[PDB]
């Protein structure tokens, strides 16, 4: 429209109405020039590629991308508390996106002095992929998302993708995608950009913990009509084999017949927070649980949803079974365990086996006069008819959605890092130049109200009563915003 | 830390009506203790 | 309703999570329903 006319306003508030939450977030961004306006093939051999598991081949593009896929982008810590304590579930419904107040700068460096000035005639290219024809990198838990604190000014991450490879080399089936080959919209400093998206139907994420356990579903006061084989021998001696039967009842609750069995398990190695309890060896990678694909061994991280530890054993954590978040200012390599925040899935133990424990035992042979009944441990158990299980919890820091890969088949497509799985998710001489502007994203959330008849008070997520140097979820004296802990969504309870 | 004497009624805040002293229980709304104090409470200050 | 713009999370009344012989605000093994503590009404905050 014009240079001296604003193309938008600052919208950054959440409205709670009925069974819906609308959250609007606006941030200020800065977009540099990546790859000097070039496409550049990248591979592992550029970095030396000393490992076959780490081999990759792909391309790096000058384009950036906006990623709002983390929850703390759209929710304040207060709005997240208001969500988790009052509700049994939530899920996204509609999406709105706006791009405005575009400001393109030129940087002229003459001698050792640099000068910044507005280049008014410049444009900015923006396009969204609604046909999902590009590689989708947003479901890989990457960085570059809008900052949790609104006052922060953030940088747009560079876009790049990977394709098929053999070692460092490519193969004939590897694909090349040019982002210039997509029709896009160009914006000057007076133009603005917007589009609206509609979430496909997804199940409510369950923000609750069960109050009963899968094995305790019985009525404690009454017996069961079914019988079990209580005794196979009269007593000590020879030729004492005999068969006896007893009623399964409140006396022995382990032997009752049950309609449902706990969820699947793929076992993890157990690590203790106390280091002297661990073995004196390098077992991070060697003792890890992994899965092999085309000869490459990828770590099974996080993997299936399983209780992190047995009740009363907080110190132990699965080796690659939990999401680990960094505290503010944490170093990129080799940091201590107090620099990271290890989340746990303790709430789901009612329906799910412990990640560091076996699923159960099976019979390994036929008992006979000359052979004792032998059993063996089930380290991994696939799906069986009659299993029930819980998914992985979502966090304020965690990702929101993921793209279901396009394949002939899948089972329980919900992503393993948490969140909502969806088939359709949301001349070499140039002038040194960059852009900046404003972005506002508006998501509509649907809620499921807590209907429980529980008499006694629930567990809630509450702030600490005591005095501290810093208010949690606030800025410090130097101005840095930080989140002290990872916050799960499961507090309220339901019946199993 | 308390005085070694019986002061529950003698040291109590009270009001008089028609020649009869009634204890000021609970009375006007006031903070029980200063911030950072957890070991002190008003004699007739709060509901029990 | 609570209209507050407070950024950080509020203090809330919660049931503590630890093992105990009973759950609070419920019956014991003899059928006696007890209330272990008084619950005030003031948790959320406002500006002055």
């Amino acid at each position: 429209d014009g240079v001296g006319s604003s193309s938008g306003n600052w919208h950054c508030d959440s409205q709670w109405l009925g069974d819906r939450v609308i959250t609007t977030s606006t941030r200020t961004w800065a977009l540099p020039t990546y790859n000097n306006h070039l496409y550049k093939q990248i591979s592992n051999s550029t970095s030396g590629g000393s490992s076959n598991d780490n081999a990759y081949f792909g391309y790096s593009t000058p384009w950036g991308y906006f990623d709002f896929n983390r929850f703390h982008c759209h929710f304040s810590p207060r709005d997240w508390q208001r969500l988790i304590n009052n509700n049994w579930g939530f899920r996204p419904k509609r999406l709105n996106f706006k791009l405005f107040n575009i400001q393109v700068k030129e940087v002229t460096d003459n001698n050792g002095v640099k000068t910044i000035a507005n280049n008014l005639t410049s444009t900015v290219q923006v396009f969204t992929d609604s046909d999902y024809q590009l590689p989708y990198v947003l479901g890989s838990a990457h960085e570059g998302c809008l900052p949790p604190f609104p006052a922060d000014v953030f940088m747009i991450p560079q876009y790049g993708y990977l394709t098929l490879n053999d070692g460092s080399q490519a193969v004939g089936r590897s694909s090349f995608y040019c982002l210039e080959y997509f029709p896009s919209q160009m914006l000057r400093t007076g133009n603005n950009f917007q589009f609206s998206y509609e979430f496909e139907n997804v199940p409510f994420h369950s923000s609750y913990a069960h109050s009963q356990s899968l094995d305790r579903l019985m009525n404690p006061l009454i017996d069961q009509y079914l019988y079990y084989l209580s005794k196979t021998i009269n007593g000590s001696g020879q030729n004492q084999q005999t068969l006896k039967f007893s009623v399964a009842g409140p006396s022995n609750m382990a032997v009752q017949g049950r309609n449902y069995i706990p969820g699947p398990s793929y076992r993890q190695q157990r690590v203790s927070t106390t280091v002297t309890q661990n073995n004196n060896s390098e077992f991070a990678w060697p003792g890890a649980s992994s899965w092999a694909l085309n000869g490459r061994n990828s770590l099974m991280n996080p993997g299936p949803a399983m209780a992190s530890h047995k009740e009363g054993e907080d110190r132990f954590f699965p080796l690659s079974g939990s999401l680990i978040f960094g505290k503010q200012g944490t170093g990129r390599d080799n940091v201590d365990a107090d620099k990271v925040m290890i989340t746990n899935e303790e709430e789901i133990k009612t329906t799910n086996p412990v990640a560091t424990e076996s699923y159960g035992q099976v019979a390994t042979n036929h008992q006979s006069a000359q052979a004792q009944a032998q059993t063996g441990w089930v380290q991994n158990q696939g799906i069986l008819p009659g299993m029930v299980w819980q998914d992985r919890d979502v966090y304020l820091q965690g990702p929101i959605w993921a793209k279901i890969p396009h394949t002939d088949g899948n089972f329980h497509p919900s992503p393993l890092m948490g969140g909502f799985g969806m088939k359709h998710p949301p001349l070499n001489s140039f002038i040194t130049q960059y852009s900046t502007g404003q972005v506002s994203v508006e998501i509509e959330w649907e809620l499921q109200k807590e209907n429980s008849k529980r008499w006694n008070p629930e567990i809630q997520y509450t702030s600490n009563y005591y005095k501290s140097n810093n208010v949690e979820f606030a800025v410090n004296t130097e101005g840095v915003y930080s989140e002290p802990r990872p916050i799960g969504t499961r507090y309220l309870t339901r019946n199993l | 830390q308390n005085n070694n004497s019986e002061f529950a009624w003698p040291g109590a805040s009270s009001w008089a009506l028609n020649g009869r002293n009634s204890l000021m229980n609970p009375g006007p709304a006031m903070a029980s203790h200063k911030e950072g104090e957890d070991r002190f409470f008003p004699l007739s200050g709060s509901l029990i | 309703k609570e209209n507050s713009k407070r950024w950080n999370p509020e203090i809330q009344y919660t049931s503590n999570y630890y093992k105990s012989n009973n759950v609070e605000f419920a019956v014991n093994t003899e059928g006696v329903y007890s209330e272990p503590r008084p619950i005030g009404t003031r948790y959320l905050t406002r500006n002055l």
């Epitope: 907080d314 600490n464 009563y465 005591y466 | 830390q1 950072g36 104090e37 957890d38 070991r39 002190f40 409470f41 | 503590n16 630890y18 503590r37 008084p38 619950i39 005030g40």
Partner: antibody
Framework: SEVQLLESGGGLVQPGKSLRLSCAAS????????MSWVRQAPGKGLEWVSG????????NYAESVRGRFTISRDNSKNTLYLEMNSLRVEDTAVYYC???????????????????????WGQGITVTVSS | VLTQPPSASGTPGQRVTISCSGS????????VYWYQQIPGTAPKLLIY???QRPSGVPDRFSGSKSGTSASLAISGLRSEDEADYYC????????????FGGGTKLTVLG
């Protein structure tokens, strides 16, 4: 064993010198229990030196250690701290970090009678004061 | 202080009683706690609030308080029940202190 208490800062100290002990608590809500320090001299019975309330507002000390020792806690960091000054040979002991079993909060008040009972202890750190 | 006999003796399967004598200020007006400690280990709580006992503690350990004296009785004494026993209670006098008894070393004979 969900509750876990650790002690650090133990050592050999010459008389007159002062050293600081720390206890790292985990597995429970720290600010809601009143911690305490109990010391056991070699070949001797347990002796309670000092205890602190959950908020930290009120602290108690044994007469023998009063005025030389000072107990403090950082609720934000879940740490119980014991600073000892003007140490002497009589102080050689194994110091323990003991957690107050009773749970209380801001709705109630701190009661030294009820809240000093200690359900769980710590491994302890030996402290030696010798010339 | 709380007074305890220096040592106590028993035979397996036989009841043993350990008792602590105290003043009005401690045993008389306050709850008495019992701690079992084995040398080289941190103490363990056996009985709290006079007769109550924590979970994970066997039924045989029973504690009671009458007047200014508290008695800890052990039935079905075992080899693993041999250790030092400490009697504790809050003391109102002399500025308020938690007081431990002198200790009692129970020896299982035979």
């Amino acid at each position: 064993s969900e509750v876990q208490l650790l002690e650090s800062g133990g050592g050999l100290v010459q008389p007159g010198k002062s050293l600081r002990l720390s206890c790292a608590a985990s597995g429970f809500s720290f600010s809601n229990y009143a911690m305490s320090w109990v010391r056991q001299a070699p070949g001797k019975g347990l002796e309670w030196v000092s205890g602190i309330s959950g908020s930290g507002g009120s602290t108690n000390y044994a007469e023998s250690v009063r005025g030389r020792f000072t107990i403090s806690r950082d609720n934000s960091k879940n740490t119980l701290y014991l600073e000892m000054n003007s140490l002497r040979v009589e102080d050689t002991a194994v110091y323990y970090c003991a957690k107050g079993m009773s749970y209380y909060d801001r709705s109630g008040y701190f009661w030294a009678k009820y809240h000093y009972g200690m359900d769980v202890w710590g491994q302890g750190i030996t402290v030696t004061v010798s010339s | 202080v709380l007074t305890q006999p220096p040592s106590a003796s028993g035979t397996p399967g036989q009841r043993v009683t350990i008792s602590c004598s105290g003043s009005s200020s401690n045993i008389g007006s306050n709850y008495v706690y019992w701690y079992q400690q084995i040398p080289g280990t941190a103490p363990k709580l056996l009985i709290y609030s006079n007769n109550q006992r924590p979970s994970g503690v066997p039924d045989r350990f029973s504690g009671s308080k009458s007047g200014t004296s508290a008695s800890l009785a052990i039935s079905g004494l075992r080899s693993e029940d041999e250790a030092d026993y400490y009697c504790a209670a809050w003391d109102d006098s002399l500025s308020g202190n938690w007081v431990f008894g002198g200790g009692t070393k129970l020896t299982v004979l035979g």
